[PDB]
mmCIF file of C-alpha atoms and ligand atoms in Angstrom:
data_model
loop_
_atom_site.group_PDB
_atom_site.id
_atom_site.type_symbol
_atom_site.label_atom_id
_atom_site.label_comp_id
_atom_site.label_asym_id
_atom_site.label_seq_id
_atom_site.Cartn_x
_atom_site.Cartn_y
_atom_site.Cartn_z
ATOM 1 C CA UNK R 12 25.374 -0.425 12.090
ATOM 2 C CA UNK R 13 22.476 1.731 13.481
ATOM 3 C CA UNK R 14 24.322 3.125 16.288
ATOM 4 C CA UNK R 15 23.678 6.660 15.283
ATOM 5 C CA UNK R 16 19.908 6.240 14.405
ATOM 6 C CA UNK R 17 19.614 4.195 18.094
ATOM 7 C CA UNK R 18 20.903 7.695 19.727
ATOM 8 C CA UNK R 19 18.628 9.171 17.726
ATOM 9 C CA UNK R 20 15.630 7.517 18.717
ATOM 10 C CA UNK R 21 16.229 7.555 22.654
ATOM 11 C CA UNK R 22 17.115 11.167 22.233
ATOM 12 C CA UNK R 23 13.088 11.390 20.730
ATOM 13 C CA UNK R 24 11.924 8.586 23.042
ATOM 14 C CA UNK R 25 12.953 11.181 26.174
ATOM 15 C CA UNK R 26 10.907 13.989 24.616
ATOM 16 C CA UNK R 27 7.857 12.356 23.338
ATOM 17 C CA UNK R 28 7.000 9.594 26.846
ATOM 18 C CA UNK R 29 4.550 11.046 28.797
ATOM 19 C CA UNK R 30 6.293 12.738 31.768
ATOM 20 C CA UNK R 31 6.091 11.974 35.277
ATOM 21 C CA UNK R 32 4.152 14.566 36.061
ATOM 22 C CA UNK R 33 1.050 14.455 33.232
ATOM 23 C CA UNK R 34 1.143 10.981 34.823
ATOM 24 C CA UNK R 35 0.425 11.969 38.011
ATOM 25 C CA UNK R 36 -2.417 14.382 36.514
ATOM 26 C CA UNK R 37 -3.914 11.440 35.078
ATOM 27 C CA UNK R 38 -4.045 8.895 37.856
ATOM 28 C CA UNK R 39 -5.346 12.125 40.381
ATOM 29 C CA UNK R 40 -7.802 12.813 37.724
ATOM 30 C CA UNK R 41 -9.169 9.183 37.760
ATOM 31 C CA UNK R 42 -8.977 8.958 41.551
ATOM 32 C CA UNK R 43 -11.867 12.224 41.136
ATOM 33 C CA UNK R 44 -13.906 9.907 38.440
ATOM 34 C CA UNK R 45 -13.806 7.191 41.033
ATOM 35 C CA UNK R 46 -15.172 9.061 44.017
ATOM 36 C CA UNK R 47 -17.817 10.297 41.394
ATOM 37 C CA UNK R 48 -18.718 6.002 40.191
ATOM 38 C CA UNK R 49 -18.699 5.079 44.461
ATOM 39 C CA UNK R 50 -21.231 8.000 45.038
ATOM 40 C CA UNK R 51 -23.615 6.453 42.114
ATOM 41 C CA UNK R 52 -22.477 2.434 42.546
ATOM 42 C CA UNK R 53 -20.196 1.279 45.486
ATOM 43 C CA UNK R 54 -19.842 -2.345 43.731
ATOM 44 C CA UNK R 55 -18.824 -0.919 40.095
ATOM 45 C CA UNK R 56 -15.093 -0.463 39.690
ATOM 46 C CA UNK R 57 -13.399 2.218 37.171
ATOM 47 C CA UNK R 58 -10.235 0.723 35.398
ATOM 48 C CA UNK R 59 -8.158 2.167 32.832
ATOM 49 C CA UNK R 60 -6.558 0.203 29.824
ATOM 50 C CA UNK R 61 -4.737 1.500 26.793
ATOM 51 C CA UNK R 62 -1.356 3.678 26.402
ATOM 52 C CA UNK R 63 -1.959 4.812 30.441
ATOM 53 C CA UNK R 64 -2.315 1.200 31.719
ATOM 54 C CA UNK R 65 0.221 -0.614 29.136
ATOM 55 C CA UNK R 66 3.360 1.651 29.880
ATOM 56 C CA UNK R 67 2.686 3.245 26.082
ATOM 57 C CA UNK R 68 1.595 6.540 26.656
ATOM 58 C CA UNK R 69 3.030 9.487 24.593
ATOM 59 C CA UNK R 70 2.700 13.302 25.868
ATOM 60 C CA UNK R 71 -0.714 14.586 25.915
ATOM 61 C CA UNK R 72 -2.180 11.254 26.403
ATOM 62 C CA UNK R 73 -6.125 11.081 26.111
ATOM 63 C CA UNK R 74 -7.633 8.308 28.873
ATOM 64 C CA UNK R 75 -9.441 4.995 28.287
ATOM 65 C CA UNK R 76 -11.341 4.047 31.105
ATOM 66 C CA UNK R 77 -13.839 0.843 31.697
ATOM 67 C CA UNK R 78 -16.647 0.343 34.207
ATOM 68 C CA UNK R 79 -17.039 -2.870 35.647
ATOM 69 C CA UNK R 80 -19.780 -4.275 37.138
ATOM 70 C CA UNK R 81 -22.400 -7.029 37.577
ATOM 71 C CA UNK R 82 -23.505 -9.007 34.511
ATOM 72 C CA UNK R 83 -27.319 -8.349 36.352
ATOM 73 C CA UNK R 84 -27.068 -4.741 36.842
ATOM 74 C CA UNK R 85 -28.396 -3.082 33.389
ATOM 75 C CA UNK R 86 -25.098 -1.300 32.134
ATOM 76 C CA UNK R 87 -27.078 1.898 30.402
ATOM 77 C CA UNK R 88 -28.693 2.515 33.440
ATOM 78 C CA UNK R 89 -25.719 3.400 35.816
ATOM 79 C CA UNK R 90 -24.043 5.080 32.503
ATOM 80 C CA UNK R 91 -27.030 7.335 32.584
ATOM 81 C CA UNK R 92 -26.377 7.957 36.448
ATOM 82 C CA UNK R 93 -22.670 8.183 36.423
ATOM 83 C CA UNK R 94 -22.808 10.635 33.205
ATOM 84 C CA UNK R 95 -25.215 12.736 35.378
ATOM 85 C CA UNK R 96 -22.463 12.694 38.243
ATOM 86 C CA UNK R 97 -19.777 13.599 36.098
ATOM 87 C CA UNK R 98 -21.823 16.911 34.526
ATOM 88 C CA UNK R 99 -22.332 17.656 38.086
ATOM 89 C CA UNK R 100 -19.272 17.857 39.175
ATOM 90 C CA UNK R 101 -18.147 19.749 36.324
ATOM 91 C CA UNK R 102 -16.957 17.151 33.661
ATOM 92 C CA UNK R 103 -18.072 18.255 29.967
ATOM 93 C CA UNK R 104 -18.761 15.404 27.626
ATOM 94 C CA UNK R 105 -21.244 13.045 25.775
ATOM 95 C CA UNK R 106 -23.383 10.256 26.754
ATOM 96 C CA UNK R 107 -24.223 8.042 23.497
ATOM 97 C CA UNK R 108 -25.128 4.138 22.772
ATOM 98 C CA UNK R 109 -24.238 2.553 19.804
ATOM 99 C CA UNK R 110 -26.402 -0.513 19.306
ATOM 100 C CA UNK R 111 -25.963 -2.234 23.042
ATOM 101 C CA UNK R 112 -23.494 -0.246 24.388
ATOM 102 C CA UNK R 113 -23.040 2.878 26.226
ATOM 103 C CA UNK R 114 -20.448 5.638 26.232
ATOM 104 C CA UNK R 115 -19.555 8.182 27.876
ATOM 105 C CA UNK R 116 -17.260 10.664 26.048
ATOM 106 C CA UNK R 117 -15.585 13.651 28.482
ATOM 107 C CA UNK R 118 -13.972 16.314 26.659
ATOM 108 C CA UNK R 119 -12.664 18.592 29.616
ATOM 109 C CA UNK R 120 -12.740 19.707 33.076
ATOM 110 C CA UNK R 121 -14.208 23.387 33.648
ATOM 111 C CA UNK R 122 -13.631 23.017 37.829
ATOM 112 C CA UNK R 123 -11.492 20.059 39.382
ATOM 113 C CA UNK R 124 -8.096 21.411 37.410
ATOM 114 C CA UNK R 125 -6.767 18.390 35.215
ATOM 115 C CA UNK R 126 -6.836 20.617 31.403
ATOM 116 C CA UNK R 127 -9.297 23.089 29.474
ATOM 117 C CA UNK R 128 -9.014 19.776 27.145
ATOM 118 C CA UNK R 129 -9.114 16.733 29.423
ATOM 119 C CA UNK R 130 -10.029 13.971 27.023
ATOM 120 C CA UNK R 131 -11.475 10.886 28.475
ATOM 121 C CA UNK R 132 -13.420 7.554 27.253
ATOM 122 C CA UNK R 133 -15.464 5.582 29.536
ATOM 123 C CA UNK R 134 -17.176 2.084 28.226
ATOM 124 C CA UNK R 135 -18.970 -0.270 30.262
ATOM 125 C CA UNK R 136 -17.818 -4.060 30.540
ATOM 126 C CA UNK R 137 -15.523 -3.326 28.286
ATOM 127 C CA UNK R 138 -13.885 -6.644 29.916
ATOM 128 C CA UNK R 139 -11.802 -7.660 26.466
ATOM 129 C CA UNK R 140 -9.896 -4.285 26.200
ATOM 130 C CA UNK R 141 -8.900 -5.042 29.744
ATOM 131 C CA UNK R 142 -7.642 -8.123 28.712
ATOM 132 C CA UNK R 143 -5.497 -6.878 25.987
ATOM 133 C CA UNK R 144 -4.041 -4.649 27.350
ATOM 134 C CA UNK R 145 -2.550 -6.850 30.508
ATOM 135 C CA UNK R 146 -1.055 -8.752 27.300
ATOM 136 C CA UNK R 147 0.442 -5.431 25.694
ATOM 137 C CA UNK R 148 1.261 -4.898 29.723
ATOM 138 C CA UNK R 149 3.092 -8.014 29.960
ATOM 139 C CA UNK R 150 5.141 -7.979 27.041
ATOM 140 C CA UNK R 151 6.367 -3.978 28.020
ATOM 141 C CA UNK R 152 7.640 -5.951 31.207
ATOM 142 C CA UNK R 153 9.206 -8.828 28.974
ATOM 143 C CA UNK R 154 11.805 -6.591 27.015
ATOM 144 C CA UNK R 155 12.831 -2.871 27.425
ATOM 145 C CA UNK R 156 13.385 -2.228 23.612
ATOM 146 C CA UNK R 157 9.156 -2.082 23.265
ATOM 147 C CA UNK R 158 8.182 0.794 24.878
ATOM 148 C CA UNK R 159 10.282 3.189 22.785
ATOM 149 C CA UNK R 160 9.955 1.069 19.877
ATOM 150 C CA UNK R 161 6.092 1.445 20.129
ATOM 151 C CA UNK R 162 6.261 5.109 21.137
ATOM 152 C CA UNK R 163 8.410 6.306 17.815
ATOM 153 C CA UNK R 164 5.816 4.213 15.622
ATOM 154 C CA UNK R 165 3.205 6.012 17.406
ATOM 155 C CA UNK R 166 4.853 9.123 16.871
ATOM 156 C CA UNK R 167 5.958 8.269 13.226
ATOM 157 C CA UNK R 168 2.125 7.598 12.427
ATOM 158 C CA UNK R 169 1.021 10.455 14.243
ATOM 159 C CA UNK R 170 3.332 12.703 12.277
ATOM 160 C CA UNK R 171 2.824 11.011 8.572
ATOM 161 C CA UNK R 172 -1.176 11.793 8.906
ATOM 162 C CA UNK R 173 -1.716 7.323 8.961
ATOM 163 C CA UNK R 174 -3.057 7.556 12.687
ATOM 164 C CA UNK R 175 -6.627 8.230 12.313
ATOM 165 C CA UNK R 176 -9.446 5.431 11.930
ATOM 166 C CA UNK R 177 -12.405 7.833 10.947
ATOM 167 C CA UNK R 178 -10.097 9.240 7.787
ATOM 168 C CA UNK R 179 -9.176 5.593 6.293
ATOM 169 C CA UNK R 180 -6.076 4.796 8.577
ATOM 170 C CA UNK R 181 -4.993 2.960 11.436
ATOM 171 C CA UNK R 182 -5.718 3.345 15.437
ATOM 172 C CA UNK R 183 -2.910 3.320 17.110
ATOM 173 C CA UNK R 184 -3.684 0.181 18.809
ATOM 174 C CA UNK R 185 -3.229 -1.356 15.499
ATOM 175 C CA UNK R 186 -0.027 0.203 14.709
ATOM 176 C CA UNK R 187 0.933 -1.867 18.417
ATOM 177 C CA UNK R 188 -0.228 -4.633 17.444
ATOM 178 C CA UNK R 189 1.921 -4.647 13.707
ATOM 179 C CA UNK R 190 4.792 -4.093 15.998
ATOM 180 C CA UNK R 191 4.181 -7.016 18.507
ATOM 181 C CA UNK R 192 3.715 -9.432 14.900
ATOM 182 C CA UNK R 193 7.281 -8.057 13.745
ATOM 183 C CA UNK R 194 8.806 -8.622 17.142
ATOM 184 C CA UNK R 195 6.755 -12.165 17.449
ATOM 185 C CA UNK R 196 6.517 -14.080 14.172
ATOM 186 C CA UNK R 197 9.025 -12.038 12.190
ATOM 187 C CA UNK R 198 12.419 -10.629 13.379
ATOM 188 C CA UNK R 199 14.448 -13.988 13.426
ATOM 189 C CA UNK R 200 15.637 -14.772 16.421
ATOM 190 C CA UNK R 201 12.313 -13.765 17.917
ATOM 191 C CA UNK R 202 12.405 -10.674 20.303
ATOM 192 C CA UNK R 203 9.608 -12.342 21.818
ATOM 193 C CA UNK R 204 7.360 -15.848 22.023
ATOM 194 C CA UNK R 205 4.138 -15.976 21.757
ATOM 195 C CA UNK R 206 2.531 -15.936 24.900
ATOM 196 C CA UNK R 207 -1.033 -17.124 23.607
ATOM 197 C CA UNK R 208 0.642 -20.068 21.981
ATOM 198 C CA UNK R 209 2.851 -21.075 25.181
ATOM 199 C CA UNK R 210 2.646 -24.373 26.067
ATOM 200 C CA UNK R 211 2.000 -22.911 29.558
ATOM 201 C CA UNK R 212 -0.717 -20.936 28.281
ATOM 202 C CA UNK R 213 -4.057 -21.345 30.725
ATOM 203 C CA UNK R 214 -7.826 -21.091 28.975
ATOM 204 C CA UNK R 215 -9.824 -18.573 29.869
ATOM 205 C CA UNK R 216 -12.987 -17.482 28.707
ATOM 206 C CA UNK R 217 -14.287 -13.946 28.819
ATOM 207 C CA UNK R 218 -17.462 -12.791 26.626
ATOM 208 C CA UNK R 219 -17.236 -15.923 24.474
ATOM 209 C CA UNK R 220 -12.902 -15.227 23.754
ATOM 210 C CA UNK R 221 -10.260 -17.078 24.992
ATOM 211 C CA UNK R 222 -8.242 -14.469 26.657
ATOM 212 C CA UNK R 223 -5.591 -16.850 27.840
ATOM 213 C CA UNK R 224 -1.757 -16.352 27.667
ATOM 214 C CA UNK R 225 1.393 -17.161 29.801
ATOM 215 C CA UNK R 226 2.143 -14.250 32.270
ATOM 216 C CA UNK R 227 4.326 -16.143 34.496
ATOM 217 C CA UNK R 228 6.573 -13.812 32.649
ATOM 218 C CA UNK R 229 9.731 -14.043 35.193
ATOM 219 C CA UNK R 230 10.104 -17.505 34.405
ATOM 220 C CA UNK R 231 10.707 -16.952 30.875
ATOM 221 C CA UNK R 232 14.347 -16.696 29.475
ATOM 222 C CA UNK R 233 15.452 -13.140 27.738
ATOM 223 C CA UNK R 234 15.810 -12.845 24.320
ATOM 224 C CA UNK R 235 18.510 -14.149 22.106
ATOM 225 C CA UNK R 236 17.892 -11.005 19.869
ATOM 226 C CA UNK R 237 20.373 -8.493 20.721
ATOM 227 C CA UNK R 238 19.538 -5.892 18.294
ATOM 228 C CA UNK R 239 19.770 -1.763 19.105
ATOM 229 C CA UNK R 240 16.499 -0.318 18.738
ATOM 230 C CA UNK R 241 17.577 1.248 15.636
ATOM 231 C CA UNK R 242 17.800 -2.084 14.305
ATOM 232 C CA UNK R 243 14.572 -3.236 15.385
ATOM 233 C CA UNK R 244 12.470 -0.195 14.149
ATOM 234 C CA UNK R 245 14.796 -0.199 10.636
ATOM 235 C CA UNK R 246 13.407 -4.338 10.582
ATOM 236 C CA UNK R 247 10.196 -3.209 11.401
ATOM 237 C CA UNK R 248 9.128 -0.269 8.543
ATOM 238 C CA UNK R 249 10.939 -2.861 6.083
ATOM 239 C CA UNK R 250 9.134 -6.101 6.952
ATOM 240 C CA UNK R 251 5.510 -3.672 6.233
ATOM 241 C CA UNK R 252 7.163 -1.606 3.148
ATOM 242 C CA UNK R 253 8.458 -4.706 1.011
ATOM 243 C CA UNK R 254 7.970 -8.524 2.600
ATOM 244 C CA UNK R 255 4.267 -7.944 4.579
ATOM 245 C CA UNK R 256 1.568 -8.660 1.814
ATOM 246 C CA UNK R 257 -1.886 -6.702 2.832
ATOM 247 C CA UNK R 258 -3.747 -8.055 -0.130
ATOM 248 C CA UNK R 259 -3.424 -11.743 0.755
ATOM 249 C CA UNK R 260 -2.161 -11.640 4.321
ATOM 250 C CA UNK R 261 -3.291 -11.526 8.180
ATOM 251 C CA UNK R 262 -1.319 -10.042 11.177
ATOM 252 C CA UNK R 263 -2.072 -12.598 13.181
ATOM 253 C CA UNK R 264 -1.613 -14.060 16.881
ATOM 254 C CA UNK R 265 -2.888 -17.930 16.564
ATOM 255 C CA UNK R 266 -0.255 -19.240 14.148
ATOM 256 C CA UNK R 267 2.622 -20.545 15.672
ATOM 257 C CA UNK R 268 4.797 -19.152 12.161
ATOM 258 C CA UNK R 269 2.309 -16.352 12.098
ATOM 259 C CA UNK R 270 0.527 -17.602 8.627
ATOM 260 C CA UNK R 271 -2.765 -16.516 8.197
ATOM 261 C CA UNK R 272 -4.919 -16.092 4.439
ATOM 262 C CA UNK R 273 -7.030 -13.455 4.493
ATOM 263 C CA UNK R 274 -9.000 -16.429 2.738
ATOM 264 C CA UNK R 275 -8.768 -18.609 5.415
ATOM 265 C CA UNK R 276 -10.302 -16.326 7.289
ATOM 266 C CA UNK R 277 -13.508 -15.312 5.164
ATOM 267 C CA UNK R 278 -12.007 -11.933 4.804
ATOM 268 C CA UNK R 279 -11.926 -10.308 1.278
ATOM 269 C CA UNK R 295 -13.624 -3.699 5.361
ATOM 270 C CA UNK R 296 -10.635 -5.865 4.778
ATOM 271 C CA UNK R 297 -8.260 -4.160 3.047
ATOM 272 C CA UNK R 298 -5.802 -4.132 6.227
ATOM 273 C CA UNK R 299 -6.324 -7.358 8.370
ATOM 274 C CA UNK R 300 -5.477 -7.628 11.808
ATOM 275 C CA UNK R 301 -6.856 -10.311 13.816
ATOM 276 C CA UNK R 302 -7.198 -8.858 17.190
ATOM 277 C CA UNK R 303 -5.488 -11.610 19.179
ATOM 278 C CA UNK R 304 -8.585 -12.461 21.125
ATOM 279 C CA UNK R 305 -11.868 -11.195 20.170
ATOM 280 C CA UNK R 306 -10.666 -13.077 16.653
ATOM 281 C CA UNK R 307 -13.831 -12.148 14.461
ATOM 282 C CA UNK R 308 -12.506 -8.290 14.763
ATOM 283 C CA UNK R 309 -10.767 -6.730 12.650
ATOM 284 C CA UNK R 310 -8.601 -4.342 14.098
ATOM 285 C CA UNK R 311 -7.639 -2.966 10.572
ATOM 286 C CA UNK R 312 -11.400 -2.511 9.039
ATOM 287 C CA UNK R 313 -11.452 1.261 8.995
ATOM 288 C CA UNK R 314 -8.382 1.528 6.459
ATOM 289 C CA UNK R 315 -9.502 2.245 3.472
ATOM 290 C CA UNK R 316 -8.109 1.758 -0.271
ATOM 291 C CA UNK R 317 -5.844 5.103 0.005
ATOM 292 C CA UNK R 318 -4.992 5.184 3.537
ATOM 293 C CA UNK R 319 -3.620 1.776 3.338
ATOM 294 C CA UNK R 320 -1.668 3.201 -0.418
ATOM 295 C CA UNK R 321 -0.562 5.789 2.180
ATOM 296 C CA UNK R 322 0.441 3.509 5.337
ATOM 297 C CA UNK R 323 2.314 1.501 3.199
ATOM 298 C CA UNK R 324 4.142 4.523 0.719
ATOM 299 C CA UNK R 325 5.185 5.850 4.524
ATOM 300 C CA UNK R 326 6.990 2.610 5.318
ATOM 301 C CA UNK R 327 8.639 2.190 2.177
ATOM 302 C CA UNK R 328 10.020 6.294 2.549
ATOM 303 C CA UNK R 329 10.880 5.141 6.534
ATOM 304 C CA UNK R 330 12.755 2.036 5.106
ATOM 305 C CA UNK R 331 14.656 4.190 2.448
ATOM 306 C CA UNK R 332 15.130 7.023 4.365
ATOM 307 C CA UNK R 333 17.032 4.437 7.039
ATOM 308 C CA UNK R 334 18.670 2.820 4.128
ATOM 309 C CA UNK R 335 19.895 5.766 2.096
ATOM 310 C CA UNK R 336 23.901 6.223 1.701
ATOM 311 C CA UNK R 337 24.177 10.200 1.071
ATOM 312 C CA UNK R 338 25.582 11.102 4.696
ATOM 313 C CA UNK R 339 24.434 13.030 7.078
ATOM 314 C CA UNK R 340 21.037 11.077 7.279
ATOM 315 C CA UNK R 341 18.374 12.913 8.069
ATOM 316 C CA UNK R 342 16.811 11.031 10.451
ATOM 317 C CA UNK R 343 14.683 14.080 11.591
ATOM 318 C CA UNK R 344 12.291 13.638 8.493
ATOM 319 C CA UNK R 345 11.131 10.613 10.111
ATOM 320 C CA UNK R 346 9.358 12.562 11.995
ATOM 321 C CA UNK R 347 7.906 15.285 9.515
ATOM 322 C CA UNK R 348 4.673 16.030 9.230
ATOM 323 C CA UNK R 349 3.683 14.632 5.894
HETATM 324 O O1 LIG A 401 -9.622 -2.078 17.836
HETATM 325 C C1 LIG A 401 -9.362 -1.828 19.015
HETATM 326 C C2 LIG A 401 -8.890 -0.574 19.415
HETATM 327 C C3 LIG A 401 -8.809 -0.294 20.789
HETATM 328 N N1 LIG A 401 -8.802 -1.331 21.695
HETATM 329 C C4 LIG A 401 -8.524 -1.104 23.137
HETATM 330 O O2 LIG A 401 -8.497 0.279 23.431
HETATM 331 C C5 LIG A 401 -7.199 0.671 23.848
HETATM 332 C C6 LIG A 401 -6.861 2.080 23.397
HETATM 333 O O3 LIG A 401 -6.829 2.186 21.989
HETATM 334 P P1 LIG A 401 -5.777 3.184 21.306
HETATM 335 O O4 LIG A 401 -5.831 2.957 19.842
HETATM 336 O O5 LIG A 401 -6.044 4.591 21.667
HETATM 337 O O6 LIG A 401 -4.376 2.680 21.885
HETATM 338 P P2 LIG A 401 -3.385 3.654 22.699
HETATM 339 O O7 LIG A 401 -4.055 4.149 23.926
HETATM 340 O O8 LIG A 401 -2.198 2.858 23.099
HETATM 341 O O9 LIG A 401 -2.979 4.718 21.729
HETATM 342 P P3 LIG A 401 -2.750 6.286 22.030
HETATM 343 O O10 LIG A 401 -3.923 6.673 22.893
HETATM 344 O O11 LIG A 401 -1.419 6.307 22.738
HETATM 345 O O12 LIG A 401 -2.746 6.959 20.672
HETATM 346 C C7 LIG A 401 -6.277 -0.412 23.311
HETATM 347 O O13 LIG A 401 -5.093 -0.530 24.060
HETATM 348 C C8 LIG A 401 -7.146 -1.637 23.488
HETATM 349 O O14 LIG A 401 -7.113 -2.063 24.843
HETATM 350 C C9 LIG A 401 -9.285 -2.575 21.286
HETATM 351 O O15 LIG A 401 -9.480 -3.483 22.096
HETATM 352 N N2 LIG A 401 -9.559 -2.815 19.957
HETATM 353 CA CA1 LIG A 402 -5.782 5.739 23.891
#
């Protein structure tokens, strides 16, 4: 049935979205990192990707921001000089490299008025996150059940403690990307088609990646899945609590019936795989660990019971418990 869980979940949708206004805060605040980047480097542009860019961005929404700029130009050099701007003009916040690659990490905002915590990632060349993201982008525009669907699961995994890479669990990125499999290669009829797989699908190469996919997207017909959201999210926690098997299996992008060995793949950390679907030789799963994944996967066999329990009233509120 569903139709009370569906109410349900819109009801939390409403609350949790970020709001119009935060929004608007967040776009201002990156027009003021902008002005800082043209004082330092007129050619280098400052683009955002993640939750802010895709249309997936919950209440209280930390930025991911990229710096492009020419191939030529030494990339820690103008990090240096852009970090120095952004101390400046009041921006608190770290300037690190890790191997190759620069970052700058700002943790508030102590003058031009967007938080006490205003927090804020800035990577350089960073071209591949832009990438996914105007996939993630694309297939928000493609059906309106994703963007609350993805939003709850965020919330869910936020909530259960199974949303934090440096403790043994999953970014949230990752917890997008399950959903996307589900809705791809899973849920029967498909909520959506693979757009890297299309036959309309164009090659293009970015950093050594194929970053190709169809985004002709109005010329693609609408699902034949006519499932509530209920439905889909009740689908979704089941396929990972019972069918999904992490010890042998890949979430994966590049198989037209979604079938990917771990083995095939050379990958036996690995105790979650998910093949990012196009810098392929990542892992987006390689910081859960033996107990977070016991943990991901004990939450999404309680979210799957919890949905499929028969003592009425449900509480559907304990979905979203902290553990
Ligand atoms: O393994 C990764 C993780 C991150 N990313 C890139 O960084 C972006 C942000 O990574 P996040 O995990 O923060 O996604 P999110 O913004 O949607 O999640 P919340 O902040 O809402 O919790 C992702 O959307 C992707 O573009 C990767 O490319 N690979
Ligand atoms: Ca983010």
């Amino acid at each position: 049935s569903h139709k009370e869980f569906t109410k349900f979940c819109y009801e939390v949708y409403n609350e949790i979205k970020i709001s119009d206004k935060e929004f608007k805060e967040k776009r201002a605040a990156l027009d003021t990192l902008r002005l800082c980047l043209k004082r330092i480097s007129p050619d280098a542009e400052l683009v955002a990707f993640g939750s802010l860019e895709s249309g997936l961005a919950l209440k209280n929404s930390d930025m991911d921001l990229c710096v492009l700029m020419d191939s030529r130009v030494q990339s820690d050099t103008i990090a240096l000089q852009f970090y120095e701007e952004l101390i400046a003009e009041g921006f608190e916040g770290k300037f690190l490299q890790r191997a190759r690659i620069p970052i700058i990490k700002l943790t508030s905002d102590t003058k031009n008025g967007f938080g006490a915590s205003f927090q804020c990632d800035i990577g350089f060349n960073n071209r591949l996150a832009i990438h996914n993201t105007l996939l993630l982008s694309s297939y928000t525009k493609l059906d309106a059940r994703l963007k609350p669907m993805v939003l709850l699961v965020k919330h869910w995994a936020k909530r259960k403690q199974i949303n934090s890479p440096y403790f043994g669990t999953l970014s949230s990125y990752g917890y997008v990307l399950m959903v996307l499999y589900y809705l791809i290669h899973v849920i029967k009829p498909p909520v959506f088609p693979n757009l890297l797989l299309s036959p309309l699908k164009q090659e293009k190469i970015v950093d050594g990646f194929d970053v190709g996919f169809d985004d002709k997207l109005e010329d693609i017909p609408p699902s034949q899945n006519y499932s509530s959201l209920g439905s889909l999210l009740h689908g979704f926690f089941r396929f990972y609590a019972y069918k999904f098997e992490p010890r042998e299996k890949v979430v994966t992008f590049r198989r037209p019936d979604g079938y990917l060995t771990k083995q095939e793949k050379g990958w036996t950390r690995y105790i979650l795989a998910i093949e990012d679907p196009f810098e392929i030789s990542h892992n987006v799963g390689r910081t859960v660990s033996s107990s977070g994944l016991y943990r991901i996967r004990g939450e999404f066999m309680a979210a799957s019971r919890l949905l499929n329990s028969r003592s009425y009233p449900i509480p559907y509120d304990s979905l979203f418990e902290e553990a």
